[PDB]
Ligand binder design. Structure first.
Ligand SMILES: CC(=O)N[C@@H]1[C@@H](O)[C@H](O[C@@H]2O[C@H](CO)[C@@H](O[C@@H]3O[C@H](CO)[C@@H](O[C@@H]4O[C@H](CO)[C@@H](O[C@@H]5O[C@H](CO)[C@@H](O)[C@H](O)[C@H]5NC(C)=O)[C@H](O)[C@H]4NC(C)=O)[C@H](O)[C@H]3NC(C)=O)[C@H](O)[C@H]2NC(C)=O)[C@@H](CO)O[C@H]1O
Ligand SMILES: [Cl-]
Length: 183
């Protein structure tokens, strides 16, 4: 079960919460819930702005320059990818994570009607990629979206746990709720 072992959110969220003024700024800029941002901070770095994963996901929202970093630079009208030092900077890190969430909402996940389903799809896509999420429904992006829209948030989570090739995928939703409950 993707909820084992249990995940206590109180501390990660407490530390995440220290970044709220930045998350508010980033969120307002990109049309993203600052609590959604904070929960992602808590789950991914536990609020450590200097954290670097074994796969080079960097900073508070654990962005990978070669994937999310590139997509955000593209969205800004820029070439290339952000540096590791830029991704360690709290403001630049949160602003880019917020931008990535908006990119996901407006691109691959466009059309998802239920706000809770969309929230869940955003976190799973953020963590394991929109392409991977969509492929658990269809090879056609918008048929995938049509299928997602047949589901409620609980069914959506069930489908992810049942079909997603990465076991961690539904665990991100479990921790998401843990974090939201601590806030
Ligand atoms: C150690 C610690 O402190 N914490 C760790 C924690 O880091 C670990 O989790 C890690 O989290 C990060 C996210 O925060 C994971 O990063 C994910 O990884 C995804 C899979 O590679 C990645 O998905 C890819 O995103 C690309 C860019 O959007 C997609 O390509 C794009 O597709 C578009 C069409 O949909 C296309 O138009 C674009 O042109 C194209 N862009 C580019 C540049 O190619 C790509 O399709 C997609 N992959 C798939 C399969 O769908 C996410 O972007 C990325 N998110 C971010 C925000 O960077 C990271 O992988 C996690 N690590 C691991 C090992 O899983 C965690 C362990 O899980 O442990 C904690 O302790
Ligand atoms: Cl996949």
């Amino acid at each position: 079960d993707y909820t084992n072992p249990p995940w206590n959110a109180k501390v990660p969220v407490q530390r995440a919460m220290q970044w709220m003024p930045i998350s508010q700024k980033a969120g307002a800029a990109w049309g993203v819930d600052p609590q959604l941002i904070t929960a992602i901070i808590a789950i991914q770095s536990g609020g450590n702005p200097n954290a670097v994963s074994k796969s080079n996901a960097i900073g508070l929202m654990q962005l990978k320059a070669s994937t999310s970093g590139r997509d955000v630079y593209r969205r800004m009208g820029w070439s290339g990818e952000p540096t590791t030092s830029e991704l360690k900077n709290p403001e630049r890190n949160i602003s880019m994570g917020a931008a990535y969430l908006n990119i996901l909402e407006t691109g691959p996940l466009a059309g998802i009607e239920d706000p809770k389903v969309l929230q869940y799809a955003l976190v799973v896509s953020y963590a394991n990629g929109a392409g991977a999420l969509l492929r658990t429904f269809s090879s056609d992006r918008k048929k995938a979206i049509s299928k997602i829209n047949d589901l409620d948030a609980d069914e959506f989570l069930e489908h992810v746990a049942r079909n997603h090739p990465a076991p961690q995928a539904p665990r991100y939703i479990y921790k998401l709720e843990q974090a939201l409950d601590a806030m």
